[model samples]
Target: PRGSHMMLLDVQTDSFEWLIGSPRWRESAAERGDVNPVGGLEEVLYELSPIEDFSGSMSLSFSDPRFDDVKAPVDECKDKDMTYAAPLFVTAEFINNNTGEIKSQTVFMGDFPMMTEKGTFIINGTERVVVSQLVRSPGVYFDETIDKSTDKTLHSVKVIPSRGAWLEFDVDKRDTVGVRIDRKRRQPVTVLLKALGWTSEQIVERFGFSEIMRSTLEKDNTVGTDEALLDIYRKLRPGEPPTKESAQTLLENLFFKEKRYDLARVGRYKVNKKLGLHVGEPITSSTLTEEDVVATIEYLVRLHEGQTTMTVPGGVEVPVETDDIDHFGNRRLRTVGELIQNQIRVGMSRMERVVRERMTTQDVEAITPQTLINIRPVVAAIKEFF
Candidate 1:
């Protein structure tokens, strides 16, 4: 008995016969067990991905295009000089005009949390953005095509630029209106804090640096040297403890200081070219080192400190006091996902252009399915994970 993970099989030879042909069935037996001891794969899939239509298209477009006052600065705007800015992640309200289905789509189009600090907007005008929805009854199915079947539904997709930003560069601008409040409401601050090694379990038993840990992190900021990370951790309960507001002040000061103590360890690693005993490899962290993990914490606390103290180009930078007014303005529900989507589109558009350029050089035309599939992984990964 493998516990509660039983699957009831109402078998017909045809079903079982086809099941044997399934790599999923085979892989399931190999990786898990004979009958998918994990009962929740379907449930997990349901929760993780909503059934939607999938599509592909080909078009002729010029790369030398310009928008408003922004002109392609390079031989084309789709080249290396334009660094790819990951889209700001946003959760937006989707209102279908026909079915009137009100669903919230989490858009990972911009760099959230940073959007507030950066005061940015989307470069692509919102309405012109094309959204693809499963226009057919079978939503989407992939025995090998898209994935298990889905119902036909419409989804609204668009590239919305932020209204205000640091450089006023359309490509980089983001709407700061609700971004601040969004940060507080989203309190990605906690997730990010935890990523930097701050723990936030007090508010929600889920651990990681959180609002409650802000005080502790702020005080620890001052210990910018490598020694401070150890000092701070020594005081923490092996399981985290709630820090006082007084500790909060110190933590803030440390983070806001002259040098980024967090990067200190990484900086050293880069300079020394050795993180631990590992030889000749760039030091990327999986588990934090006594030397660098603390440095990251110090750096994050400071970076977060700036979130409250700074100002945007058009609006005043204020602390993430509440979720409602997170954006600098009284804009409606603006989530972080939206910001990331546009950024990804910008990158994809360039990549598309690149494919065209290469095709042109080789004296070939039309992007093939194999060519599209090869690059899709890169784009999808960026959208899903970044």
Candidate 2:
């Protein structure tokens, strides 16, 4: 009825359609789908499927909602303190090799919410809207602060992912670079470099040999890739027996794996733009590449070098400045679409966990077409994401 929340859920629903029914995913879910892929919806569906040794592919598509046919239409639902929503039908076309099961089925998902044209919600008959977080943006930022006690200046770089772990690198009082994985224990930068396949020569050559690199390497006995990988893995996940391949998996999960980590287009653009990479806007990569990682790791050297401005690859002189949390530019808003998508991701993961659990203890003899697509977790997820 109004613009206040006019485009709220309406446009959000449209975007969700694109997310689910994108032509690209129909051809190949493993290839690509939506813009913000935080452990893709396609991947979640695959993980949630019970038939594991499944050798076939699964494709998901959702039907157009029927808001008018709902028992409580928008007007009545709003006035009656009911949810203004419509029926959502989800179709799954899957071929399984484990039990020779092949099927295409459409199941009722849930009563997906509908926002008022005014851009508001009438949950329990009260108008409600969404706000944003306290000044946080998804991107790579460098922060500078002074440690009065040590009389030292600290330069730190923080890479905040759209949907994944945080990698924070800081210059310590010892003039050595240290990294904190998801805010865990601090480890030497050399360890991370070597873990990411950077050799001693690569480290020295990139940053230019300095005392910080020398002492960091000397302090770090793990020089080889496997050795460094294990070192960081142990540091990140202590108290567990460490193995070589598990260590490999751990590193890959941290950044390389799409399901475990995500860097939205905004994050990728800011990273590439800020770090002097030649890449341009709206990058397709949903995770950090080796180039971005190298820039992130090696850029610490320049921050400590004290040169405010430096020339980039094209001789484009860019000034290096620490980020200001208070700046309006630094502060960001989580749009209604973004918030709902993230919430959906969280909910789907919950269903995925349930599926994994059921797959383990339950027998598959009684499973029908409508069995795994139970109403409890799947439908209940989107119905209550306030």
Candidate 3:
């Protein structure tokens, strides 16, 4: 699970669902929807699949397009300076905002890049292959290193989200725990806790008494929660006149929001497992929780005591620093399907704007998928990189 994974399920359900067609989840709302779509295509279509017009009344949903050979075979496309592709006939349905009128049709969206039997693409005579990327696996990692100047062992905890910024916490020679957001200048860890609404008393309540937590809070720059937030805002966005609203929202976008700070299933799982918390389910950990945050601080405190091993909930002791950066478990490959999915995302969003613009500008009755959909963005995306 750490390295490369089988994307057959992703391709069949998430990828093909949008690239091919969307299977009906249920016959009716009253009927039981398929409890599991493990068999379905990975639908990359969702971002722009169902879109509303400017008036927010009329909305459109698209089904996967039918594939047909248009420009002969790969070899011919190589000779003709044409993209070896297939014409996509997609079924689009529009629902009237005011009226309940529905119009559906198999509209010709455009040509799509076709993969050869050898699993390669031919774009204007050049055959291309999607290469995999070596990327760091998303998870929480703890490392202890000796400080060069002082020679005191520095304990650090890093939480790498599957998306968004990297969060890091480390203890300095002064024994004050400092936090860094996306590798920015460090600030007292307690400042962040205060901003998160954890008061000075609550910090000790959650993680027990520690000079690390206590000492940091001693000369704490910010007093109240709102004040703590403003200090963080100034540090993160220097020279900008800070306001409480943007300060609060900045913190929201950094950790609280799903669209920005996505820990993802794996990252959440690792946080629970490594911290000895049996907080069950990926559903429970899309965002940072108070428990995880407090536990991470406790782990830092334990490390400061020169503890190399700590007993977890199961009465078994786990070594704190068994893993390293070069370990196989720390690395994974970003392979084909995921790469294309990412590429498709930009195109889908751009196309979505195009469709929305046309939906409002063009006559409603005359609006069709052909007029609404812009294949250029999608095609350009595939052509640009691959």
Candidate 4:
């Protein structure tokens, strides 16, 4: 009777449906619509999308994953040592800039290999697993170091973001405060703050530094906000004369020089936005306001004054100091879903560039859903995963 029961159960539930179905289990088979295993992917794509425009709002949504109708090709690909992948599609919506006509359409993204229910891929009939990448979450991380020659400790802070500018504050060769932005470009902290629209009096007044510190900052003599911008322009172009008009020209040139959909224009906007965040608040891409820069300045000033020390027990306490990039606690693993989001962002950027180029050639009235959204770039990005 046991043998008969086992055979009957095997015959009753023996299909590859479970293997291809979403890796989710439920109390009853009828509860399918109530849950979605792939819903997170949709949310991420929507959030990271860059579809805003003057004409109207644009958006992409991955409604569902489509699979081939026949299992024969998938099985045959396995036998023939070939990749078995299915086409992915996304729905795009566009609103007219002038007329405000809202239109939406489903567009083909690219081929994506279906993962087995076991969370492995079928590549050339071989099972392969994609590994998650470990990376730091985008935010501020601080560290301190000891100067062996001086027998004093130095502290530094770095602000990292998902994209756009990079800023760091550290002690410089002259033992004075300095800031570096966007790579190797270094300048006095006050000058950079001034370039970002901080006035000399405002800087001294807000940071509450000693007279010596104030005097040191004033040596740059960046007097006005506009003068600070001119100073930066002079640094960027040493031979150029320092005039208000010349400074404005340099900014436009440095930030929006591209003839086609200027990346620098967008980059400048992002730089301005990111540097302006509130201190003591959690950072979101949008919530980063102007006060954040002031807060960062405060942190740096505090570090310069050796105010980070706290009394605990017998001795003074400072932060644990090491420059180990391999600190496990500092990193978060990039899940497969998050990794997909990054690839999608890269693809969408490429697509937007092309769309902007094409839009330049066409009349505003001629611009349509077909012209803006192209699946080739997005598809290529998705194909890179395989």
Candidate 5:
């Protein structure tokens, strides 16, 4: 096997061919249309301000990455022990308010590590892999539990988001399904639902479960449900001297509490905004609609029966579990491209808030894209990986 001898077919110590050929990558590529990363960034930038007088729209598009110097960034990284990174440029059109004029410019977003087509990086002239990060996908997940002491089955649903509130619900709670926002404290689900414009009658008509399941749940949380009902009775009847109306009030208030009705209105609005209004179709099964709420409750009830999983009409069935939040199957892989997109999104969001605040104080003509877009936050977001 010397100079004139046979050539080795291959040195098969290990292979990352699988990483390049991953079906998940193919899936990610195929579903790019679901959310065009550039388009999303543009939309976020465009909707920065609500008031037309203070508002300006932005359209953004990305070009190929490039290094500042003529020499390869990878080579410089090797010599200086630096990261092999390049600047991402975005072309943005800023629409003016008074003049109705448009100012267009290509600006540097920030330097980001460059990844090869194979999803690996050339860092310090050494080929390094950028492993995909696992994140819980934004959507609602349901699970069930049985109280050891009361032996009542508790059916629960979690509204998971990519960024905002983490709202949890226990539909089988004896006090008539309770909701916890950000896990801070529990409240009657009825008040939360009511604040979103649903009546107590509507909840009873729509969210009822099987008689057997309902009976078992009611037994354990009598005091809890009683307090909730007393509140509703007062709200509806006031000082009618607490008539027998408390009976129907109890049923209706299973989800509401009188003492917290005012707070519930605001809290319920926040809960709705967090769980129902903001989420997309694939997550909430529809936009911010009453039907979506009903469907979520129904799905949780089904989950309580130990179904373990549920599916949309044509959507995928994500895992349903309470035991292990860290289960591999429950986590979705975010590739480098996806991760970068999210960081950009977060950067843009932070930029929007700052820009909005500054716009209030500064004159329109004096404001420029340079003044509005701060790259440091964007840089910080990207640096999180390192």
Candidate 6:
């Protein structure tokens, strides 16, 4: 009766309320719940006893703002249509990790929809979501250093944003994050690069090794490689060609053997192809607009999306289409976890060949998406030069 593991689940309509008269609540499960069925309650109590009690912070969580019970729609821009936003909340926490004493670290929670054009980034004081990626001292019961190499230190967890889900958190005060080497646990960057089969020397040659701090690494030029560079490029301008630094970041992210993040694992072909682009040069004589490059990248992404034939602006069937065609011709350059590598090869070979031959707008017209797809092998055939 004294010890148990108690918590909530699903918290649908009324999270604060408990099921009063449900047979399940009054059944054996309720009594069973009072004991540490899965894990021993004695051990948990022992850990908690050291702290005696803990200080805490508070946050909110909601399904949607509909709970506000507003009557009429309030969108003055579009026929007074009320817009529905997702639930918002701050998480109340009683963390016992700060200063090795029971301290409070309040964090706000919010989500972003990847498929939709409009995204919500809550930045308000209580409304903002705060997050931490601890690569340091132990927190709670988690000792997070297996992911690191050299030592076994503690760390925080970071969730990857999937196609449907994206998360953001806000930090109210200015505080620097940390990275502690628990005797031998190396930092995330070292471990990440090491996983890619890169030696510490190679990591340094590529990523500047110890010279590059985490903050700089987070910015640019720390974990340097062709793949990491491309990733950097994509981050700056998604679905576009890599700049010099981006190309380096992409290479670091992709080939660095120490670690394997989801971004590196996914869209490998895209990384390889972009790498080829970085090494290859001046395929097209004319300076292409950013819009043109983006359009081409979108087409390539659609190719991965597997859309056989998508409608154009005129509702006409465009044969060269991929699945993730959000709009008529709006395509993303991705597969489930792959990318269209060799924009020049799989994307722009014949187009270049045709353009070079006649040197006119008419020649450009001949370079269709289908033609580019077809010319991939040819580009491969002449990989050394444009």
What ranking emerges by lDDT with the best candidate at the front?
3, 2, 4, 5, 1, 6
Worst 10 residues of 4 by lDDT: 1-10
Model 3 Cα lDDT, one tens digit per residue, 1-386? 24333434333333323333334323321255444342111244533456765356668887654667566877788888778778766678877768778888786655767656666768788887655555777788877788899998788888887766678899888888899976778998888898889887877775555777778888677888999889888787665456677677677767766645778888787777777666444356577766666667667777777666665443235555623564667766665555666676667667876776777688877876667778788768866766
Off by over 4 Å in 2: 1-71, 74-82, 86-111, 131-139, 147-152, 160-166, 172-176, 180-188, 204-270, 279-287, 305-320, 325-334, 350-385
Q: Which ranges of candidate 5 are over 4 A from the true structure?
A: 1-72, 96-101, 116-119, 122-128, 133-139, 145-155, 159-289, 298-332
- Please provide TM-scores, in order, for all candidate models, with all chains considered together: 0.17, 0.60, 0.56, 0.56, 0.50, 0.19
Tens-place lDDT per residue, model 4, 1-386, is 10111222221121122322334322223364555333433543444343433222332223443344433365686788866667655666655555656666676666656655555557778776555566654555556777877766666766655433356777643456666654546667787677667676777776645443475585666676687777776665454346666565444333233311122333233333333322233323332334444555565555566564322222234333223352655454455544655676667657765664454455566566576767688778866866
Ranking by TM-score: 2, 3, 4, 5, 6, 1
Score candidate 4 by lDDT.
0.52
Model 6, which residues run further than 4 Å from truth?
Answer: 1-87, 92-261, 264-386
Per-residue lDDT tens digits for candidate 6, residues 222-311, read: 343444434434443333434554344333332232222222222222322322222233232222122222222223323323434433
Model 3 steric clash pairs: 12-41, 13-40, 13-41, 13-42, 14-41, 14-42, 14-43, 15-42, 20-64
Candidate 2 per-residue lDDT, tens place, 1-386, comes to 11232344555533444344444334443455435432233444433333331111222222232223444656776678887665656555434446656666776656656556666655666667654334356788887888878989888898888766789898888877888987779988888888878888877777664577677777877759988878876786565456677677667767876756777777777777777765444477778777766676656667677766654444245566776553666545555555655666567655543443343344555443365455566556665765
Candidate 5: residue 180 lDDT (0-100): 67
Q: Estimate the lDDT of model 5.
A: 0.48
Question: Among all windows of ten consecutive residues in candidate 1, which has the lowest summed lDDT?
Answer: 164-173
- Cα lDDT of model 1 by residue, 245-333, tens digit: 32332233233322111223333343222112334455453222333323222222323323333222223333321122223321222
Top-scoring candidate (TM-score): 2
